[PDB]
Amino acid sequence: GTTPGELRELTDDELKDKLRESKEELFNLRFQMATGQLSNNRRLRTVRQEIARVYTVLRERELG
RNA sequence: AAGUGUUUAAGGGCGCAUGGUGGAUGCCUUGGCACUGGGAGCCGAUGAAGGACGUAGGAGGCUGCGAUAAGCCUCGGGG
Numbered sequence A: 001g002t003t004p005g006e007l008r009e010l011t012d013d014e015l016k017d018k019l020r021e022s023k024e025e026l027f028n029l030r031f032q033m034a035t036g037q038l039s040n041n042r043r044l045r046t047v048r049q050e051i052a053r054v055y056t057v058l059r060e061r062e063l064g
Numbered sequence B: 001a002a003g004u005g006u007u008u009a010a011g012g013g014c015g016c017a018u019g020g021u022g023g024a025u026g027c028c029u030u031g032g033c034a035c036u037g038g039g040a041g042c043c044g045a046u047g048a049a050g051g052a053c054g055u056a057g058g059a060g061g062c063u064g065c066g067a068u069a070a071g072c073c074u075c076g077g078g079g
């Protein structure tokens, strides 16, 4: 839900915070999907792609 | 009285009319076969060729991808 653009003003530690918050979110809605009370399915994909985006930006910061 | 003499179809044959089965024939094609002209002529410890297992909101196969998993970023195209 957040463009990779506005992830470049965030430092390493707060990018890491964003990433762990997102991983916790993903665990929660994975449980909700398993128990049957998640109707919105595209939420899983968006959060999974957000995690991938956060790693991508971190690696780009490391290398250049 | 003597004599003559049609009609049987359990079933079978042949001809026709009507169907079934079967998948030939005709007419085709998301497939191939033989070449022509170019390109590129190597990939691999910066882990190859090729695979295993996984991966989509729902079971499998083919495809794509690899725990960042039908995808992630940047630059162009286009709509």
Ligand SMILES: [Mg+2]
Pocket: B009
């Ligand atoms: Mg008869």
Ligand SMILES: [Mg+2]
Pocket: none
């Ligand atoms: Mg050589």
Ligand SMILES: [Mg+2]
Pocket: none
């Ligand atoms: Mg597969």
Ligand SMILES: [Mg+2]
Pocket: none
């Ligand atoms: Mg573009």
